[PDB]
Amino acid sequence: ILELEAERELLNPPPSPLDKKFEQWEEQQAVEATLAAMKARRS
Amino acid sequence: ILELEAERELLNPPPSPLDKKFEQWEEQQAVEATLAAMKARRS
Amino acid sequence: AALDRGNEQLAREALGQRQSYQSHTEALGKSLGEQRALVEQVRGQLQKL
Amino acid sequence: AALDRGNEQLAREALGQRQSYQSHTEALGKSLGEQRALVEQVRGQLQKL
């Protein structure tokens, strides 16, 4: 199983820890920015 | 029986505990809001 | 008839029962509204036709 | 419906759920926009043709 599991890991390289950090970073901005209007729209 | 019961659970995923919380939360609002008029209409 | 004379408890369950029908009511209402544009469109096709 | 009455916490998760759909929405939107120039081009080919 580990043999096959590793085989794919080669063919589909995992996303770098970098873009993981940025996607998490950027995503938190959209929710806060998007939520910012609502918390001000109907405060 | 458990084999078949689980088979459906895959094909029709259960509603998340999230929407369960919100539907219960929102539903309590309609009954109270709807009942609010009656308790004030014919107090 | 329920909360009159101060029997509010019974009224609570009554409206809760209504809510199940209310949910089914809303879905049909939106479904009914959607179909109207369709039948008007198809008849208009035929009348031009 | 969430952050009304000060229940901001629930709203946070709700928008987070929307973001997954939002990402899929953006990809389709750009894909939809791209295809329009193609169909206009190919029809224009045929009309001249």
Added chain:
Amino acid sequence: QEAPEDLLERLLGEMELELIELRRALAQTIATFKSTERQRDAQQLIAQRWYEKAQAALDRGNEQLAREALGQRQSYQSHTEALGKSLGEQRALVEQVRGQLQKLERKYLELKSQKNLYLARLKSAIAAQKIEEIAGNLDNASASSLFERIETK
């Protein structure tokens, strides 16, 4: 060699058969997962029946009998702990494998969506060239034989 356009339909079909195979395989995992849960519950009930018996023993000062009762419960308790840890471990597995599948199905239909779009272009291009070469037969450079040759005749 076969036309790769035909392979496009057949290749997706093969992947469809496997998706249901994974589908049935996952259920087998869940079915066993539930069964292990029940066995833990039954044994602790036996231990509880021994504890509820111990909820009858040392009363009135018959402590000796209670001692043996809990000792009996300990054998079930040891088996209970192993299943509990085993049950906890499996939960992350089933969540992981389902998450794999859920991400997986989306990737399928997305590929299927692009399948027809590129087939349309190929039909367009083949439907595009096969005429203009015939229009090329009526070339203005006299390479034509249908049109200029008859005029010279």
Added chain:
Amino acid sequence: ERKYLELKSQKNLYLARLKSAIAAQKIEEIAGNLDNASASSLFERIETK
């Protein structure tokens, strides 16, 4: 006897993983056929055509 059923319990769990893994690889290699590096022949070759 306890040792027997315990072994039998683990039997199916590891068989499930093997079916998962084999059911896991045989698709992504087909997804690999649509690789973005032009190693594909089904998708990029037709476009170049």
